[PDB]
């Protein structure tokens, strides 16, 4: 019944090596609800929510060759939360990581992914409260319990990726999360601007010309 | 019915230093917390630092810290943004904030926290 106003923080550029990695953090009482990243080439091995200080923070990798990348938090004012982070370790062998909230109640505000490789394979080409990443990444899903809270999926594909692509929440939600469908060569990386996900992509021509998708997690309560 | 006055910004090189300077056009008006924010284009209006009456009261933006420094002169009824050791990436448009009443919360980072806004002064960094 309260309203959910959320903000994004980014971090400072992390510097050119693939051990080189850039945080970005809410305030002390603000819940971290989803993490991005973003590189100016490309060249980055995605990002993950993990525990500092008993706070979640939005950490992101770079790739080697790299330039360096920046963590991109989304930090939300949510009353009485309890938010936790599950993750699904890559399976190779796999079409595609998947994890999603476990516990009754628990709602996904938010999807991370990261993978250990230089950059992504290619392979052959969404459920409630669910996460899906490439097969070589990890999956990270940003899981809460907060009285009221209710979130979906809206999604926004364009076959010629240009500059960007973008998805933005109807009126009456907050956008929490945003991100990239996988499988889609050539993203730079993915931000929230207000209620609009944007996904920057390297303009890059076909070589089946597939579809650059904004992926866009919605929230309310009540 | 209360304008907040922006002074300073502009072009400055990298490495170089900066001082905004933001008051009401009306000084008998004391807000309870003083702001900074800042825009690059196609983002949000991004948090930067926040002041009240203390230095507990006072809260940056990781990306800004160690460098950057806020500062509030009540006879003046004037907030300060210096800016030292400027990177390309400080490159946006800045805004100063004013939230009139008290907060709950240690730290006021949301826009919808603040109550009045300055025009935006524009702060280019060189190479
Ligand atoms: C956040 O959640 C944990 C786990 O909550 C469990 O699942 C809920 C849906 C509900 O059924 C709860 O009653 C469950 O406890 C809270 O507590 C943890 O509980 C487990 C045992 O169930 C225990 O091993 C952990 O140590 C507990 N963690 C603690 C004490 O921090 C946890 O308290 C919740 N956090 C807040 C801030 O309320």
């Given at each position: 019944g309260w309203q959910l106003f959320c903000r994004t923080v980014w971090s400072a550029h992390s510097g050119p090596t693939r051990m080189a990695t850039a945080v970005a953090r809410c305030a002390?009482?603000?819940?971290?609800?989803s993490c991005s990243s973003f590189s100016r080439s490309g060249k980055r091995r995605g990002e993950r929510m993990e525990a500092q200080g008993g706070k979640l923070v939005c950490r992101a990798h770079n790739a080697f060759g790299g330039e360096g990348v920046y963590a991109i938090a989304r930090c939300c004012l949510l009353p009485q939360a309890n938010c936790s982070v599950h993750t699904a370790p890559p399976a190779?062998?796999?079409?595609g990581t998947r994890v999603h909230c476990h516990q009754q109640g628990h709602v996904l505000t938010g999807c991370s992914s990261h993978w250990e490789v230089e950059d992504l394979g290619t392979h052959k080409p969404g459920q409630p409260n669910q996460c899906v990443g490439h097969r070589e990444a990890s999956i990270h899903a940003s899981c809460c319990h907060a009285p009221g809270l209710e979130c979906k999926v809206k999604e926004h594909g364009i076959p010629?990726?240009?500059?960007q692509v973008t998805v933005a929440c109807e009126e009456?939600?907050?956008?929490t999360g945003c991100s990239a469908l996988p499988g889609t060569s050539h993203v730079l990386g993915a931000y929230a601007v207000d209620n609009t996900c944007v996904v920057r992509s390297r303009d890059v021509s076909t070589t089946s010309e597939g579809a650059v998708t904004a992926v866009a997690i919605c929230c309310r309560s009540r | 019915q209360v304008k907040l006055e922006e002074s300073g910004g502009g072009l400055v090189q990298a490495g170089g230093s900066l001082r905004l300077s933001c008051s009401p056009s009306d000084r008998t008006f004391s807000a309870y917390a003083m702001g900074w924010f800042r825009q690059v284009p196609g983002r949000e209006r991004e948090f930067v630092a926040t002041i009240r009456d203390?230095?507990?009261?006072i809260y940056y933006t990781d990306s800004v810290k160690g460098r950057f420094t806020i500062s509030r002169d009540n006879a003046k009824n004037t907030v300060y943004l210096q800016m030292?050791?400027?990177?390309?990436?400080?490159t946006a448009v800045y805004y100063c904030a004013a939230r009139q009443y008290y907060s709950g919360?240690?730290?006021?980072?949301?826009?919808?926290?603040?109550?009045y806004w300055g025009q935006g002064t524009q702060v280019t960094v060189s190479s």
């Open positions: 002390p009482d603000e819940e971290l609800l190779e062998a796999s079409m010629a990726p240009q500059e009456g939600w907050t956008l | 203390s230095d507990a009261s030292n050791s400027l990177i390309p990436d400080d919360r240690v730290y006021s980072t949301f826009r919808e926290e603040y109550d």
